[PDB]
């Protein structure tokens, strides 16, 4: 089997995925502008009457009311979704931790290092005992 | 001369420890060899029997389909009879 070609495929597909993310973001921006222009029609009122000005202002106030209601509803829904996302993230983190935390530790850091410390102490014991004479 | 003899005794004990290491290593290695072989044989047999069961299950699926169709037929006949 091959192993380096696996990494080559990974690198190429990751770059391709980044390109797809970029183009999808550009498509989202274009569609955002398109839908914004769709819902928000432009108006021009050159040489207008005061009564029609009041009618347009009242219609805009009603639009403000409805848009604020919709933004409030979507904000509350998104905040509940964010709380749920945090809860699910916490639970999955707890699962992963209880699965993998015992598996990480400092293996044989000093156990291998024990070469002659006890042996050195034993030899120096006899040396120190003989140092008296 | 006495210092050299002390050195010799130290070397002797270290050689003893080394042979001890050799023996314990061999023993554990033979043990793991036994476990390896037994595990491998049992894994082979288990895979074989599981695949056998899978085949039988697929055959049962087909049998059940046949029976379901025939029951549909008999039910239609009975209701028309009614």
């Amino acid at each position: 089997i091959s192993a380096s070609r696996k990494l080559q495929l990974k690198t190429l597909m990751l770059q391709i995925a980044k390109q797809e993310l970029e183009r999808e973001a550009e498509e989202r921006r274009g569609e955002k502008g398109r839908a914004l222009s769709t819902r928000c029609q432009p108006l021009e009122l050159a040489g207008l009457s005061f009564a029609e000005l009041q009618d347009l202002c009242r219609q805009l106030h009603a639009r403000v009311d409805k848009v604020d209601e919709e933004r409030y509803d979507v904000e509350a829904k998104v905040t509940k979704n964010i709380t749920e996302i945090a809860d699910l993230n916490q639970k999955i983190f707890d699962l992963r931790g209880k699965f993998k935390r015992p598996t990480l530790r400092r293996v044989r850091i000093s156990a291998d290092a024990m070469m002659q410390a006890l042996l050195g102490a034993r030899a120096k014991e006899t040396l120190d005992l003989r140092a008296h004479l | 001369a006495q210092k050299d003899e002390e050195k010799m005794e130290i070397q002797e004990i270290q050689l003893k420890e080394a042979k001890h290491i050799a023996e314990d290593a061999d023993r554990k290695y033979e043990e793991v060899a036994r476990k390896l072989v037994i595990i491998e044989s049992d894994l082979e047999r288990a895979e074989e029997r599981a695949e056998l069961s899978e085949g039988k299950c697929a055959e049962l699926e087909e049998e059940l389909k046949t029976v379901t169709n025939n029951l549909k037929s008999l039910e239609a006949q009975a209701e028309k009879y009614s």
Binding site: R101, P102, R105, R106, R108 | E31
Partner: protein, 375 residues
Amino acid sequence: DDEETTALVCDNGSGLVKAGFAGDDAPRAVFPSIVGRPRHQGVMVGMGQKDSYVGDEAQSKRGILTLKYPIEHGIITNWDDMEKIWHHTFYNELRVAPEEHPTLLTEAPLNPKANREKMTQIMFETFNVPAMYVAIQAVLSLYASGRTTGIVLDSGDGVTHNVPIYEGYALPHAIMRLDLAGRDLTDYLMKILTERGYSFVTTAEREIVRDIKEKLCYVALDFENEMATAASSSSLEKSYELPDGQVITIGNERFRCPETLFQPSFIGMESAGIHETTYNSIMKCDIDIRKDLYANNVLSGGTTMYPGIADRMQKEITALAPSTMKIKIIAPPERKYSVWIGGSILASLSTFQQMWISKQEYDEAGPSIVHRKCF
């Protein structure tokens, strides 16, 4: 990480004290727990003779000492000696003052309360640790295996106990603690060696018999066949060189010493062997978690290191258990230090960091705090 400090995972045990900082793979210092006063008179002046050699120092001067273990069966019978052992462990084998380190002792199940309370009182008054926590020796051995269920048989040197656990919920009504362990096997081996002529009596020669047991004895797969074979051929007789020469030859004493585990009638104990107290401990559990306990039987502790025990025990349980269940016996190669590895893992957890018995809490409720919520 950052501020803060490391925890001391001590593990008193009975026979070998194992200690080390939390988060490693193996204990830093492992040494027998014996304190031996000299017994002869002593004529050399100025030799610098101390009044008590503890730890591994008294296993080298054991020729003129009277070694005496301070822990008999899990419980501690001689508090001054145990305090001396702890002081040695902290100051000379680890060289870390206890004023700046949490400690995590371990205790056998079903032990007297006074032992645990005195342990915490010592740790808080004499050594003056910041915070200490006492944990059951079997839950740690279950941590080290990376499981979360299973019934663990922790046959130490003092006491053999068998704690079943499912999904993290321990079953307190199914703990079967039996007081046969490595020390009784040493005494029985020392008692059956006399059938060939070798007499070991002194408390120092008990160590020699322990070495014989460790290096030569093994558990027979089938007892009667081995007894018949050893009585006809001579392929079993293995020799061993005493600390002074005069090699000895062990015949069928090899597999008769550790056979006491499965037939405690040899040393006069009434109870059933470690092969049947596990099955009884399982049968006390609920009917729906018996399959998982059957499949995840865990071995731990030093005495379960006999060559050939993981097969004898499986054969016995398979004989007892229903024929359909699968019996599997987990016997990791790092059996001896399994409890301490589990202790290190538990002390290294973030979720556990608020379970320590903080010193101010002890000051408010006294030593009886250990039985309270902080278990």
